[PDB]
Write a protein that binds this ligand. Structure first.
Ligand SMILES: NC(=O)c1ccc[n+]([C@@H]2O[C@H](COP(=O)([O-])OP(=O)(O)OC[C@H]3O[C@@H](n4cnc5c(N)ncnc54)[C@H](OP(=O)(O)O)[C@@H]3O)[C@@H](O)[C@H]2O)c1
Ligand SMILES: NC(=O)c1ccc[n+]([C@@H]2O[C@H](COP(=O)([O-])OP(=O)(O)OC[C@H]3O[C@@H](n4cnc5c(N)ncnc54)[C@H](OP(=O)(O)O)[C@@H]3O)[C@@H](O)[C@H]2O)c1
Ligand SMILES: NC(=O)c1ccc[n+]([C@@H]2O[C@H](COP(=O)([O-])OP(=O)(O)OC[C@H]3O[C@@H](n4cnc5c(N)ncnc54)[C@H](OP(=O)(O)O)[C@@H]3O)[C@@H](O)[C@H]2O)c1
Ligand SMILES: NC(=O)c1ccc[n+]([C@@H]2O[C@H](COP(=O)([O-])OP(=O)(O)OC[C@H]3O[C@@H](n4cnc5c(N)ncnc54)[C@H](OP(=O)(O)O)[C@@H]3O)[C@@H](O)[C@H]2O)c1
Ligand SMILES: [Zn+2]
Ligand SMILES: [Zn+2]
Ligand SMILES: [Zn+2]
Ligand SMILES: [Zn+2]
Lengths: 352, 352, 352, 352
């Protein structure tokens, strides 16, 4: 078995490993369509999550089941499935507490290319098949399905953590594929006015498409300044962080009004700390809640977004700005993700 | 002043009353647009809410402020306003409890055509104008605006009470204009699949429009069986009740899965008790939460729903199937509500 | 293997079965201390859950692990453990929804004496040891610890479903063991005034001890009237149903104010429906929420209550009014639970 | 009329002014008991809230209503009442969003010794008596009562924001009187283990008195370290911040497990930004929600905490380490708070 992988911090390059074996509960999947993510770029070229050695990358993929363990009951070989970037061990205390995202340690729920071989290989392992895989409906295009395992789920969580109220006006700081899914999320939580913050033109279109009502380019003056202007000093009810500097937090705290919420689904790679503006936080008494969590995973989080897509509640295909054929183009795609061209949102490498 | 009032249970007509006078915190408004409600019919032809004598009916209207108390600070004569069906007294313990709908007593938030002359008059009084009036953007048409005060706020509340999760599948029992807004609200909360129940063609047609993905007619047999079959025995995540007799409650509990919620916004005008089936409620342990509350009123509520219409997140105008002109047509619209003709959803009477 | 079982509705006796065997993830436990429950009385002499054939009763026990599967990592034979009345299979869709109590179906998390042989056997089975067993601290006596599996977790769930707020006055309807634990629960959630309803002197004294501040006897007039008098027409903030007829639901809805909660933990064994007062439930808009749930189970649930007993926040021992020695007394005790003598709260049988 | 006031930053002293007059909805009150608050120290000798000119200090008091506006309905002269440190204008939109503390502006709900003349005067003004005053039962001692307005509501609020679950282990950072009430608060929320951080002997016994089970002296090592050891690498479920430097935020996050909550009620006076460890906050995906808000005020808040004290759910009197007689000592009492003696938790001044 061959596959892309992080050799060492900053060092990438294909390698060779064993076709993994399915435990009695696990399943082995063969990639049907995959995509790269800024998350890999961070942990690889910045050691946000320490160093690793020859660890196949990629967490986003849909594909078919090659073989299942004796105990697997809802998946046969040859079934098409959506594999969540999050595949936690479902029998730990974190789960009983209500946090599979951290089943077995902080962020432990996130296994692929973090603490396990990723989806960028002729085959990949999936722990607890019946709990971590989802049947992919034929009606849903491949390039669209691959947006669910990590873009949709992460973005939507953004909208979930924000406690959006019907008609509330929301601000989405950063409009990359995740930030964009947050704009869709907010629309879905019944947000009224959505203020998206970003410059890449193609993103600005997407944002408007997924629901953005007001675009705010962070090159026409400070962001806090421009928003307080649009909202007339009132501010925003909720603000979701989906990209930017560690100081983006300071910006969000200032634009949300008191009793508002700062929902963060962004992954901070560098910096030893994140700052909170003492004054705008009411010296700690302004009632502005700060949230930040790893996106939900598991079969359910996937069955549900499927429905969202199936019942045309959302169309993630608009995030796919580049479609590459055949395995080989993984490296191309990966790098294409490194130095983000200016016409890019999300690239998808079909395999079969 | 002339007004269409309830004369005595089972009798209605136009009467003569003094033009109301504003207290320092009130405002006197003239109707630009009003609409009749199933509610008034219940309190006039069912005596569901005790009796009344010469109580001007109606509680759905957009108007123009005519005069204001000495303490009103945000509304002047000439201001076009969206008037909430619920005009609570904002200085009570209920308010401090987070239940303004019950400020002063069970359902006391609802004053118009309850314990205070309604809007079906040349002029009508609004208490605490600054807290209970919202400025109506010119962009939004009268017939759409007159949907916010009651239809939209109620419908959406069923949605809110359902605690709908992203992608969940909800059932909306009863698709009158309220049921219709519940569907809309369901879609607004990220609902995936939406099973709408009702038979009137105009409703089934509007339901599909607002987001219903499945139609179930209670005339082809028991709702519970049809819904259980539509869901392959899985049942629905949430059920919003917006119609039917008392036995609709049982039906709700039976179609919702353990841990789901039955959200009620329907006005049960007849009967002594509502029945909850034991076995299907898990003999009291099915974790099937039952909710039932009055629609939210007040300024903020109205502003937010206005934003929904303004930012095209919803277009209530599709609920209007009959529009008449002039004061004399109030009585016609009203009767058009007593005897529900097949092509009706909601009628609006334009006054200028 | 010998064990006390339900032969069929209205029939209970001693039977014989094989010492069960443990799959790779289970453990076999021998009873150290067990107690009977009112829940079994219903299912048997009322067939409230339908027919049952030759099923060992009981589901409240603390015992010693006798053997474990090749996969049980946290429990060796000889380990003293508190076994939860609810032992769900932690790998299902319900668990991913936050309702392990209905893992695999409504009430399916409750296996012992429901759809699996109970704890009144020489030995009994426990599915998923690392997920369904909790180590018993030596500092906690058997007679007290066995109050944790069902009584403490149920009464507390009442308090949990009630959404109690600091200083709020709660009403507990029914002060049996569960009710008594609900009173403790209310107190543990910061309840101010607590009105307990019952009549058994032994129970009343017990309520005062766990936090009751007022005692209403349902043999001195209707509950509603008495409680409306103690609260001066204001009513209570929440009512936790913990016993009574089917009509108890209506009492609850009448005594709680608008926006309050009716939290049921009682398990109704008779009747087709449970009545809901149309008017006192504000015709469906009084915002009076109704909840009913099966007590939490699993390991974490037990560890948390263990802790409450350990750090002395609660002492269940007062529930135990009868203690007996000998495996043959499981019956004496069971029958004791059948025809409730005036001086009995809870009976416990010590086997070793 | 005399009053102890802040003449400017660093300059305190007595002043004379015109006895305030009530608007038709307000009430004038004379203090029966008052108490200095560390908060006032921060705003005087630190200007943590900019500067003020000749503003009577103090905001914690219980007095007797001397007179009321023609609209006040529930309060009369002679009526002994508790006065919440927070008295908002209940007719704002912040109120409609559910955040009275920020009615009309961030923290604008807190008027006394902030943007309004405080309670250290022979008389003071209380706006909107019917919404901002609660009767004081004869049975509650004055020194106990004067604790409710600020210490109790704030400490409890910390515990409320903490989202504490039954049997959870909570950590209280800073056992000042607030922290002391946070502890009782966590005890009231049904917490099991409670780790209290502090070193003042007198506060340590108060902490053990209100429910602490573990004491952590910031002398035997780093807070972060001792708590980890105490929780055997597991960490705490919730962290309630009631003291420390800006860095204390970092400690907190560091000790709460993923998916836990950091609740702050501590008023920071120095610093520009509060630090959040990028790593321990799981790079922002740890799900460690952070909350911080100005304590609740108003009548209900006071009524609820009053019932708590009355029903003996908390005895705040143990916070009162210093009692002073005569209106004149108010100044000494204040100073006693500037230079924190080692045997003081909370000083009180009884006038009559
Ligand atoms: N750990 C996980 O499992 C996981 C999963 C999902 C997501 N995530 C996190 O979520 C992020 C998703 O973002 P993405 O990859 O789609 O795109 P990205 O490149 O990470 O973010 C792009 C967005 O941020 C804006 N931006 C850049 N610098 C900014 C600044 N200083 N202030 C404000 N906005 C700024 C961009 O503007 P332009 O348009 O001008 O470029 C664009 O709108 C991930 O990279 C990762 O951090 C983590
Ligand atoms: N109290 C207030 O102030 C207030 C204010 C606003 C709203 N509301 C609430 O909103 C509603 C107002 O009425 P509305 O506009 O919703 O229209 P409606 O005409 O009252 O109800 C229509 C819906 O009920 C259906 N229906 C009738 N019988 C049924 C049955 N046996 N089983 C299932 N569905 C059945 C209708 O189907 P067909 O098409 O076949 O008839 C339609 O789906 C009330 O429930 C009221 O409580 C109350
Ligand atoms: N399925 C499960 O796993 C599970 C687990 C735990 C609990 N439960 C349920 O919870 C209950 C457990 O037993 P328990 O502690 O509640 O003791 P109980 O003996 O079942 O109930 C005793 C209480 O009900 C009162 N009562 C009886 N009729 C009443 C009426 N008409 N109005 C008001 N109160 C009335 C009793 O009054 P007296 O003082 O005169 O008796 C006492 O206050 C059962 O109903 C059981 O089904 C189920
Ligand atoms: N604005 C408002 O309405 C409002 C209301 C309520 C509370 N608050 C804020 O909360 C504060 C708490 O009340 P308080 O003033 O009575 O007490 P305090 O003096 O603010 O705090 C005392 C506590 O902090 C600990 N402490 C001091 N330095 C520390 C450090 N470096 N690291 C860790 N712990 C440290 C103390 O330890 P020792 O035992 O060693 O002294 C003690 O446990 C209020 O004064 C105010 O700032 C504001
Ligand atoms: Zn990723
Ligand atoms: Zn209506
Ligand atoms: Zn039981
Ligand atoms: Zn203070």
């Amino acid at each position: 078995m061959k596959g892309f992988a992080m050799l060492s911090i900053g060092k990438v390059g294909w390698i060779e490993k064993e076709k993994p074996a399915p435990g009695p509960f696990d399943a082995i999947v063969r990639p049907l369509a995959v995509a790269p993510c800024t998350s890999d770029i961070h942990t690889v070229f910045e050691g946000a999550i320490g160093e690793r050695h020859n660890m196949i990358l990629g967490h986003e993929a849909v594909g078919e089941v090659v073989e299942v363990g004796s105990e697997v009951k809802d998946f046969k070989p040859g079934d098409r499935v959506v594999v969540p970037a999050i595949t936690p061990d479902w029998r730990t205390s974190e789960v009983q507490r209500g946090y599979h995202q951290h089943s077995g340690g902080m962020l432990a729920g996130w296994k692929f290319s973090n603490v396990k071989d990723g989806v960028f290989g002729e085959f990949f392992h999936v722990n607890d098949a019946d709990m971590n895989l989802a049947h992919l409906p034929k009606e849903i295009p491949l390039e669209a399905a691959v947006m669910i395992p990590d873009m949709m789920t992460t973005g939507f969580h953004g909208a979930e953590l924000a406690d959006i109220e019907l008609g509330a006006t929301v601000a989405v700081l950063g409009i990359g594929p995740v930030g964009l899914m947050a704009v869709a999320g907010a629309k879905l939580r019944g947000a009224g006015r959505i203020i998206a913050v970003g410059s890449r033109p193609v993103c600005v279109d997407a944002a408007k498409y997924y629901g953005a009502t007001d675009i705010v380019n962070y090159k026409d003056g400070p962001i806090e300044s421009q928003i307080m202007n649009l909202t007339e000093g009132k501010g925003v009810d909720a603000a979701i962080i989906a990209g930017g500097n560690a100081d983006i937090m300071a910006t969000a705290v200032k634009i949300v009004k008191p009793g508002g919420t700062i929902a963060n689904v962004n992954y901070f790679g560098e910096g030893e700390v994140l700052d909170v503006p003492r004054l705008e936080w009411g010296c700690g008494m302004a009632h502005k809640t700060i949230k930040g969590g790893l996106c939900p995973g598991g079969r359910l989080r996937m069955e549900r977004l499927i429905d969202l897509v199936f019942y045309k509640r959302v169309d993630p295909s608009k995030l796919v700005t580049h479609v590459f054929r055949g395995f080989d183009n993984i490296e191309k795609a990966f790098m294409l993700m490194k130095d983000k061209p200016k016409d890019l949102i999300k690239p998808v490498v079909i395999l079969a």
